Amino acid sequence: AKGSTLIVVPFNQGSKQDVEALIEFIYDTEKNGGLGWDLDAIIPFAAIP
Amino acid sequence: RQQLQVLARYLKMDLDNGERKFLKEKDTVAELQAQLDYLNAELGEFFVN
């Protein structure tokens, strides 16, 4: 929709380094290579059977 | 030094062989240490210990 942005990132929820790096990337300023976003929702539906 | 190199050539002695093996092994040490550093950054010092 208008105003919607999809950020597709590679990610391994099984690695805490990726967890920290993804959250840092989301929260960092656009100047520092981040998104400058503040999350309103978290939906961690990643799993392996 | 020139006389030594001539004699080594005659003897088919590779003076640099030990050093070459040492640099190969040092690269192997670096790669195994990289793997261990990753596992330590991942599980943490407390978990690994």
From Swiss-Prot, chain B:
Note, other: Present with 17000 molecules/cell in log phase SD medium.
UniProt name for this protein: Fatty acid synthase subunit alpha
Subunit record text: [Alpha(6)beta(6)] hexamers of two multifunctional subunits (alpha and beta).
Residues of the full protein shown: 340 to 388 of 1887
Organism: Saccharomyces cerevisiae (strain ATCC 204508 / S288c)
Span of the signal peptide: none
Function: Fatty acid synthetase catalyzes the formation of long-chain fatty acids from acetyl-CoA, malonyl-CoA and NADPH. The alpha subunit contains domains for: acyl carrier protein, 3-oxoacyl-[acyl-carrier-protein] reductase, and 3-oxoacyl-[acyl-carrier-protein] synthase. This subunit coordinates the binding of the six beta subunits to the enzyme complex.
Record family assignment: Belongs to the thiolase-like superfamily. Fungal fatty acid synthetase subunit alpha family.
Modification after translation (UniProt): 4'-phosphopantetheine is transferred from CoA to a specific serine of the Acyl carrier domain by the C-terminal PPT domain. This modification is essential for activity because fatty acids are bound in thioester linkage to the sulfhydryl of the prosthetic group.
